[PDB]
mmCIF file of C-alpha atoms and ligand atoms in Angstrom:
data_model
loop_
_atom_site.group_PDB
_atom_site.id
_atom_site.type_symbol
_atom_site.label_atom_id
_atom_site.label_comp_id
_atom_site.label_asym_id
_atom_site.label_seq_id
_atom_site.Cartn_x
_atom_site.Cartn_y
_atom_site.Cartn_z
ATOM 1 C CA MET A 1 22.103 109.218 88.791
ATOM 2 C CA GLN A 2 23.135 106.689 86.146
ATOM 3 C CA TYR A 3 21.614 107.335 82.718
ATOM 4 C CA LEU A 4 18.656 105.098 81.821
ATOM 5 C CA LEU A 5 20.234 104.042 78.519
ATOM 6 C CA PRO A 6 23.693 102.639 77.666
ATOM 7 C CA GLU A 7 25.923 103.894 74.861
ATOM 8 C CA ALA A 8 24.029 104.157 71.600
ATOM 9 C CA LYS A 9 24.928 101.544 68.989
ATOM 10 C CA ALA A 10 27.194 102.848 66.215
ATOM 11 C CA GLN A 11 24.271 102.631 63.800
ATOM 12 C CA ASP A 12 21.983 104.511 66.230
ATOM 13 C CA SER A 13 24.313 107.404 67.184
ATOM 14 C CA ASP A 14 22.912 109.713 64.489
ATOM 15 C CA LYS A 15 19.316 108.505 64.875
ATOM 16 C CA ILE A 16 16.548 110.104 66.906
ATOM 17 C CA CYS A 17 15.695 108.250 70.128
ATOM 18 C CA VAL A 18 11.961 107.586 70.473
ATOM 19 C CA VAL A 19 10.380 106.840 73.847
ATOM 20 C CA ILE A 20 7.137 104.903 73.379
ATOM 21 C CA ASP A 21 4.492 104.247 76.023
ATOM 22 C CA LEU A 22 2.454 101.035 76.265
ATOM 23 C CA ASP A 23 -0.971 101.283 77.879
ATOM 24 C CA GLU A 24 -3.553 103.131 75.784
ATOM 25 C CA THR A 25 -0.806 103.954 73.299
ATOM 26 C CA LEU A 26 0.138 100.621 71.705
ATOM 27 C CA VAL A 27 -2.415 98.439 73.494
ATOM 28 C CA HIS A 28 -5.250 98.395 76.018
ATOM 29 C CA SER A 29 -5.367 95.791 78.789
ATOM 30 C CA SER A 30 -8.127 94.794 81.195
ATOM 31 C CA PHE A 31 -8.809 92.385 84.058
ATOM 32 C CA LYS A 32 -12.421 91.974 82.964
ATOM 33 C CA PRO A 33 -12.721 89.221 80.340
ATOM 34 C CA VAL A 34 -13.020 90.674 76.851
ATOM 35 C CA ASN A 35 -13.820 88.876 73.610
ATOM 36 C CA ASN A 36 -11.364 88.565 70.732
ATOM 37 C CA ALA A 37 -8.412 89.690 72.894
ATOM 38 C CA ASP A 38 -4.957 89.447 71.275
ATOM 39 C CA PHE A 39 -3.004 88.346 74.342
ATOM 40 C CA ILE A 40 -4.364 86.722 77.490
ATOM 41 C CA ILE A 41 -1.515 86.389 79.961
ATOM 42 C CA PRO A 42 -1.085 85.640 83.671
ATOM 43 C CA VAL A 43 0.074 88.394 86.014
ATOM 44 C CA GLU A 44 0.713 87.670 89.686
ATOM 45 C CA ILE A 45 -0.618 90.264 92.117
ATOM 46 C CA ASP A 46 -0.355 89.793 95.883
ATOM 47 C CA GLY A 47 0.232 86.082 95.380
ATOM 48 C CA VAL A 48 -2.728 85.472 93.074
ATOM 49 C CA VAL A 49 -2.474 84.808 89.344
ATOM 50 C CA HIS A 50 -4.846 87.041 87.402
ATOM 51 C CA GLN A 51 -5.564 86.777 83.695
ATOM 52 C CA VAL A 52 -4.922 89.970 81.750
ATOM 53 C CA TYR A 53 -6.723 90.584 78.464
ATOM 54 C CA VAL A 54 -4.619 92.614 76.050
ATOM 55 C CA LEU A 55 -5.956 94.115 72.814
ATOM 56 C CA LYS A 56 -3.486 95.388 70.189
ATOM 57 C CA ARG A 57 -4.075 98.813 68.685
ATOM 58 C CA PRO A 58 -4.820 98.568 64.944
ATOM 59 C CA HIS A 59 -1.689 98.799 62.756
ATOM 60 C CA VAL A 60 0.687 98.311 65.665
ATOM 61 C CA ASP A 61 2.574 95.621 63.740
ATOM 62 C CA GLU A 62 3.233 97.826 60.728
ATOM 63 C CA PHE A 63 4.015 100.600 63.227
ATOM 64 C CA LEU A 64 6.710 98.874 65.284
ATOM 65 C CA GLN A 65 8.400 97.416 62.190
ATOM 66 C CA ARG A 66 8.765 100.830 60.591
ATOM 67 C CA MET A 67 9.643 102.752 63.761
ATOM 68 C CA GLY A 68 12.270 100.158 64.607
ATOM 69 C CA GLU A 69 13.954 100.843 61.264
ATOM 70 C CA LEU A 70 13.736 104.617 61.530
ATOM 71 C CA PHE A 71 14.734 105.247 65.136
ATOM 72 C CA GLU A 72 16.418 104.065 68.298
ATOM 73 C CA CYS A 73 13.172 102.948 69.945
ATOM 74 C CA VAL A 74 12.836 102.624 73.710
ATOM 75 C CA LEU A 75 9.842 101.243 75.610
ATOM 76 C CA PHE A 76 9.106 103.487 78.573
ATOM 77 C CA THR A 77 6.032 102.502 80.559
ATOM 78 C CA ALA A 78 4.747 103.430 84.012
ATOM 79 C CA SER A 79 3.493 99.886 84.556
ATOM 80 C CA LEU A 80 5.393 96.993 86.196
ATOM 81 C CA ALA A 81 7.712 94.747 84.162
ATOM 82 C CA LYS A 82 5.885 91.574 85.242
ATOM 83 C CA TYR A 83 3.181 92.829 82.904
ATOM 84 C CA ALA A 84 4.868 95.028 80.277
ATOM 85 C CA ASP A 85 7.672 92.556 79.564
ATOM 86 C CA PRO A 86 5.496 89.658 78.343
ATOM 87 C CA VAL A 87 3.357 92.081 76.332
ATOM 88 C CA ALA A 88 6.483 93.629 74.813
ATOM 89 C CA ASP A 89 7.897 90.181 73.994
ATOM 90 C CA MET A 90 4.748 89.412 71.988
ATOM 91 C CA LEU A 91 4.475 92.839 70.342
ATOM 92 C CA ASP A 92 8.059 93.391 69.223
ATOM 93 C CA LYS A 93 8.863 90.650 66.721
ATOM 94 C CA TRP A 94 11.476 92.851 65.059
ATOM 95 C CA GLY A 95 13.646 93.896 67.980
ATOM 96 C CA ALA A 96 12.461 97.459 67.448
ATOM 97 C CA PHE A 97 12.968 98.196 71.148
ATOM 98 C CA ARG A 98 16.649 98.754 71.969
ATOM 99 C CA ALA A 99 15.611 99.007 75.614
ATOM 100 C CA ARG A 100 12.690 98.665 78.007
ATOM 101 C CA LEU A 101 12.084 101.034 80.890
ATOM 102 C CA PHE A 102 9.373 100.416 83.483
ATOM 103 C CA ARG A 103 7.759 102.003 86.538
ATOM 104 C CA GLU A 104 10.974 102.452 88.567
ATOM 105 C CA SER A 105 12.610 104.458 85.783
ATOM 106 C CA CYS A 106 9.897 107.089 86.113
ATOM 107 C CA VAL A 107 10.163 109.867 88.669
ATOM 108 C CA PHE A 108 7.205 110.178 91.009
ATOM 109 C CA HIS A 109 6.883 113.939 90.569
ATOM 110 C CA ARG A 110 3.858 115.596 92.177
ATOM 111 C CA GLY A 111 1.654 112.486 92.160
ATOM 112 C CA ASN A 112 2.559 111.420 88.618
ATOM 113 C CA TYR A 113 4.888 108.840 87.107
ATOM 114 C CA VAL A 114 6.883 111.209 84.935
ATOM 115 C CA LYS A 115 9.349 110.247 82.226
ATOM 116 C CA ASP A 116 12.283 112.630 82.528
ATOM 117 C CA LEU A 117 13.790 112.681 79.040
ATOM 118 C CA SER A 118 17.084 114.296 80.105
ATOM 119 C CA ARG A 119 17.400 111.081 82.120
ATOM 120 C CA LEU A 120 17.795 109.088 78.895
ATOM 121 C CA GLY A 121 21.309 110.193 78.059
ATOM 122 C CA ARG A 122 20.481 111.315 74.520
ATOM 123 C CA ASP A 123 20.723 114.758 72.871
ATOM 124 C CA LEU A 124 17.290 116.363 73.435
ATOM 125 C CA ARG A 125 17.325 117.873 69.941
ATOM 126 C CA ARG A 126 17.215 114.197 68.996
ATOM 127 C CA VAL A 127 14.521 112.810 71.312
ATOM 128 C CA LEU A 128 10.784 112.241 70.884
ATOM 129 C CA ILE A 129 8.178 110.767 73.228
ATOM 130 C CA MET A 130 4.844 109.263 72.246
ATOM 131 C CA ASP A 131 2.504 108.939 75.210
ATOM 132 C CA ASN A 132 -1.275 109.334 75.278
ATOM 133 C CA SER A 133 -0.830 111.111 78.622
ATOM 134 C CA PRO A 134 0.821 114.583 78.451
ATOM 135 C CA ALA A 135 1.414 114.353 82.204
ATOM 136 C CA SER A 136 4.135 111.774 81.483
ATOM 137 C CA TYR A 137 6.310 114.439 79.860
ATOM 138 C CA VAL A 138 5.694 117.590 81.881
ATOM 139 C CA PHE A 139 9.399 118.451 81.648
ATOM 140 C CA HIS A 140 9.624 118.055 77.867
ATOM 141 C CA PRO A 141 6.377 119.225 76.228
ATOM 142 C CA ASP A 142 8.323 120.109 73.089
ATOM 143 C CA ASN A 143 9.756 116.636 72.514
ATOM 144 C CA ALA A 144 6.289 115.124 72.325
ATOM 145 C CA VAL A 145 4.350 113.668 69.419
ATOM 146 C CA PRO A 146 0.715 113.702 70.706
ATOM 147 C CA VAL A 147 -1.180 110.439 70.420
ATOM 148 C CA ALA A 148 -4.836 109.730 71.197
ATOM 149 C CA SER A 149 -5.706 107.260 73.961
ATOM 150 C CA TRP A 150 -6.969 103.951 72.568
ATOM 151 C CA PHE A 151 -9.341 101.441 74.135
ATOM 152 C CA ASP A 152 -11.243 99.393 71.540
ATOM 153 C CA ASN A 153 -11.993 101.390 68.377
ATOM 154 C CA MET A 154 -10.998 98.831 65.729
ATOM 155 C CA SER A 155 -11.395 101.687 63.276
ATOM 156 C CA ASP A 156 -8.567 103.652 64.915
ATOM 157 C CA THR A 157 -5.762 104.623 62.509
ATOM 158 C CA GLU A 158 -3.584 106.898 64.647
ATOM 159 C CA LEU A 159 -0.531 104.651 64.516
ATOM 160 C CA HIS A 160 -0.804 104.446 60.727
ATOM 161 C CA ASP A 161 -1.478 108.175 60.438
ATOM 162 C CA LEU A 162 1.575 109.079 62.541
ATOM 163 C CA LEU A 163 4.161 107.222 60.443
ATOM 164 C CA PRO A 164 4.196 109.938 57.767
ATOM 165 C CA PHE A 165 4.961 112.460 60.513
ATOM 166 C CA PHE A 166 7.632 110.302 62.110
ATOM 167 C CA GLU A 167 9.019 109.823 58.600
ATOM 168 C CA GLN A 168 9.337 113.594 58.390
ATOM 169 C CA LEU A 169 10.882 113.889 61.855
ATOM 170 C CA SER A 170 13.592 111.356 61.009
ATOM 171 C CA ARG A 171 15.004 113.674 58.342
ATOM 172 C CA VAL A 172 15.285 116.867 60.393
ATOM 173 C CA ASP A 173 18.431 117.958 62.227
ATOM 174 C CA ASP A 174 16.593 119.144 65.347
ATOM 175 C CA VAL A 175 13.081 117.999 66.354
ATOM 176 C CA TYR A 176 12.499 121.304 68.150
ATOM 177 C CA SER A 177 12.493 123.136 64.835
ATOM 178 C CA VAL A 178 9.334 121.142 64.034
ATOM 179 C CA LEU A 179 7.765 120.826 67.513
ATOM 180 C CA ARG A 180 9.094 124.341 68.278
ATOM 181 C CA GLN A 181 11.451 125.213 71.177
HETATM 182 MG MG1 MG B 1 -0.444 105.370 78.410
#
């Protein structure tokens, strides 16, 4: 198989690669009309245009800006691009994402859309994955930075609370020394 990522940019060669999920991690989307939604976009399903209501997780702006500076960020979602792309276009105003990986880049392993990190093409001692669903990284439990699932708690601060930890991770030689393995 071809690696999921191209050669790392000169400036990103010595940086940790961070795989970030979308749904329930950075945002929460729904087909049922919600009030005060952040994005309300059209998504075509079976020939019918449906309106998707997307809510942004608190502090996601400050989050993406900072993460984009610290690491070689990669969007890796199990959803279809027809949905994740528009959302990503509106979320990433800083070009934090060096790449976007969707459903097809996952491996359907034992009923789950798994994100195989060795598939990235980056040194695993230099790879992290943030996904509210541990099932997404069954093969690399020690490269994960646990994140709570978000739905609508406007009082949520997880993204803000995790920056200090990511800050710390960006200065270590091997992420396993911290996440052990
Ligand atoms: Mg998710």
